[PDB]
Structure formats: structure tokens, C-alpha cells
Amino acid sequence: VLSEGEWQLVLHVWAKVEADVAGHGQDILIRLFKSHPETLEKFDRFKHLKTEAEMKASEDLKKHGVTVLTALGAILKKKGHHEAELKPLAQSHATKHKIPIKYLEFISEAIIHVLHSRHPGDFGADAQGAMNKALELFRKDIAAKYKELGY
Ligand code: HEM
């Protein structure tokens, strides 16, 4: 589990993200889609986007980026007790959207990359290690639910 100090580093940089949820959402999803094209194929809403410029110009993508980061924010703020927040997410992503745990690892990488780009001062090695731990916890718990339903 993460220590109180680790959660503090995670939430300190996350407070910086909340100042521009939409901007962060775009960078993260675009990074995910470009680095791992197979993830884009999972979104019927975004499959038509063929260039980074098109992705950046999509208000629909920006809207989803907010949805994603808002859900993640609520999870991170629950620190070591995010059971209630994960249930609906793990459920939909396993059976409805069919998102393998590996894709959650990909988006975690994208999140960490964008955080470093936008908040280097509050995202040094210690904060980076803490965020990695928080995102690993997120994936681990979702994975447990995935195994439960046989996905
Ligand atoms: C930080 C990790 C993620 C979070 C917090 C997150 C959160 C959400 C939320 C809140 C929704 C809308 C409600 C729902 O259906 O549950 C959603 C929908 C969806 N997510 Fe995620 N998601 C994450 C990662 C991913 C990844 C990695 C993929 C695909 C590779 C993905 C694919 C989808 C799809 C396809 C939908 C349905 C979109 C639609 O039809 O409008 N998500 N996600």
C-alpha cells in the first residue's frame, strides 16, 4: 500500500492537474492514441481521427478527457480506500468496453508523461515514483475485479 507521504505527493501534483482538467485530458488521450494505436480502435467515437491535429481539434475527445480525469481524480482522492469508485469502472471496462489491463498500463504511462511535461516542479523522482505506485494500485485492483468476472 502507499504511505501517507506517497499519497501527499500524488495529490499535490493532482491538484495542479485539476486547474486544467480538459487540457490534461487531451494530452493524455492523444499520447495514448499515438503511442498505442490499438487503444484508439476501442473508441467508436474517435476511430475517425487519423492525425494528431484532428485529435486536438475534437471537442468530443476533449469532453471524454474530462470524464476520464474526473473519474481518476475521485479515485486518487480516496487514497487507499477507492473500492466504491472502482466497481462501476472495472465492470464497464471489462464487459462493455473490453479494455485489457495492458491498456490501463498504457494510459498510466501517458498520464505520467503528461504530468512530467506540465508539472516538472511538482513531479520530480519522488512524486513520479508515488504516482506510479498509485496508478499501479489502480490497475491491480481493477485486475482483481477482471479476474472475478473472468475477463
Ligand atoms: C485512467 C483510466 C481510465 C479511466 C478513469 C476511465 C474512465 C471512464 C469513464 C468514467 C467512462 C464513462 C463511464 C463508463 O462507461 O464507465 C469511460 C468510458 C470508456 N472508456 Fe475509459 N477509462 C480509463 C481508461 C480507458 C482505456 C485505457 C480505454 C481503452 C483503451 C478506455 C475506453 C473506454 C471506452 C471505449 C469507453 C466508452 C466510450 C463511449 O462509448 O462513450 N478507457 N472510461
UniProtKB/Swiss-Prot annotation:
Residues modified to Phosphothreonine: T67
InterPro entries referenced in this protein's UniProt entry, alphabetically: Globin (IPR000971), Globin-like_sf (IPR009050), Myoglobin (IPR002335)
Top EC category: oxidoreductase
Residues with PTM Phosphoserine: S3
Keywords linked to the UniProt accession: Cytoplasm, Heme, Iron, Metal-binding, Muscle protein, Oxidoreductase, Oxygen transport, Phosphoprotein, Transport
Quaternary structure note: Monomeric.
Stated name of the protein: Myoglobin
Species assigned in the record: Physeter macrocephalus
